């Protein structure tokens, strides 16, 4: 066969150890899920440094903890602007997930609290910014570079899916790069802890699986489709399906056709044809052998999955880092004030 006896034995033992890990990790997750942490700090514990982002619901600020000197990213959501935007459930759920998960490629919620008017989530500051900026600057990543990131997403999805969590918003914009060059996944507002099927139209057009576009009940296989889109975009510098308008994007997604740049390796094209598979009964990640069809694919032949998990692999790229508190990998915003002074439904925060 393909594997000699010693190689088959080592692979089998590796897969059983993963199962042992996931069992223990689901037990830890459920304990925190059932008994979340609340109000582990307060606003005056922090100095405001810089606004890193803003939107209709709130802003994200670089803050420094006054006593430890540690920098954090503080998400500030205004309770009234969330209640009046149909986002209460997503915000409660995102905080519930973040305080319960534990994985080396998920940004860590360090503190959370609320005051009279705002919700606050204080997470470890990831100073390298989004993969998006680096990808657009460099143009495209080499296949070994793309594989380094892809392997982390594979493990992160393997973790989340074992918790019955579908992630649903994979894209370079949501992948932060830390000081060791590893990925930190941000944003769990669209994630849903559901076995079986779910129906919500959500995600980003370029990354939508066909079954989402087609108004089907769908399952965790949409995350594996999105991995195919991400691997393609990392290696090509542009996603597999694009157009002027989303409706034209959706027609290409559902057509079951994808074209590859001539520099894509044969192994990469084969992996991507199996992830960007419209037919659910044939899409990798969704078959009898689960994630192992992906981890055992030829394109990942050189990947030491445990070494990736242990963060022992030297990253192919380390963002420039002029020290703690460096803001250079983020844009510049007007520094609006944070004023205090909607208890209903936010009781659980």
């Amino acid at each position: 066969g393909h594997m000699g006896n010693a190689a088959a034995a080592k692979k089998g033992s590796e897969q059983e150890s993963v199962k042992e890990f996931l069992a223990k990790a689901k037990e830890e997750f459920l304990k925190k899920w059932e008994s979340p942490s609340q109000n582990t700090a307060q606003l005056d514990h922090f100095d405001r440094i810089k606004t890193l982002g803003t939107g209709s619901f709130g802003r994200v600020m670089l803050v420094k903890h006054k006593e430890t000197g540690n920098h954090y990213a503080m998400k500030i959501l205004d309770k009234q602007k969330v209640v009046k935007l149909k986002q209460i459930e997503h915000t409660l759920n995102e905080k519930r997930i973040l305080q319960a998960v534990n994985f080396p490629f998920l940004v860590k919620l360090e503190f959370s609290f609320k005051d009279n008017s705002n919700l606050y989530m204080v997470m470890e500051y990831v100073p390298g910014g989004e993969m998006f900026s680096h990808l657009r600057r460099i143009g495209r990543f080499s296949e070994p570079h793309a594989r380094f990131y892809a392997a982390q997403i594979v493990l992160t999805f393997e973790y989340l899916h074992s918790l019955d969590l579908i992630y649903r918003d994979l894209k370079p914009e949501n992948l932060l790069i830390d000081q060791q060059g590893y990925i930190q996944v941000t944003d769990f507002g669209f994630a849903k802890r559901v076995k079986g099927r779910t129906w919500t139209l959500c995600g980003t057009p370029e990354y939508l699986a066909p079954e989402i576009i087609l108004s089907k009940g769908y399952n965790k296989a949409v995350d594996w489709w999105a991995l195919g889109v991400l691997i393609y975009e990392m290696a090509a510098g542009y996603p597999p399906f694009f157009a002027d308008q989303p409706i034209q994007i959706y027609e290409k997604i559902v057509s079951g056709k994808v074209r590859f740049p001539s520099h894509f390796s044969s192994d990469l094209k084969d992996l991507l044809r199996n992830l960007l598979q419209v037919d659910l009964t044939k899409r990798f990640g969704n078959l009898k052998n689960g994630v192992n069809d992906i981890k055992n694919h030829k394109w990942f032949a050189t990947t030491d999955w445990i070494a990736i998990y242990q963060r022992k692999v030297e990253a192919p790229f380390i963002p420039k880092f002029k020290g703690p508190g460096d803001t250079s990998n983020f844009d510049d915003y007007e520094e609006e004030e944070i004023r205090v002074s909607c208890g209903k439904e936010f009781t659980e925060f």
């Binding site: 989004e130 657009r136 894209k171 980003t204 057009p205 542009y238 694009f242 157009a243 002027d244 074209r259």
Partner: peptide, 18 residues
Amino acid sequence: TTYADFIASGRTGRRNAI
């Protein structure tokens, strides 16, 4: 070319969710 078509798409910047 595909790269040229990508630039022409106007979808090279950060993409919002639906």
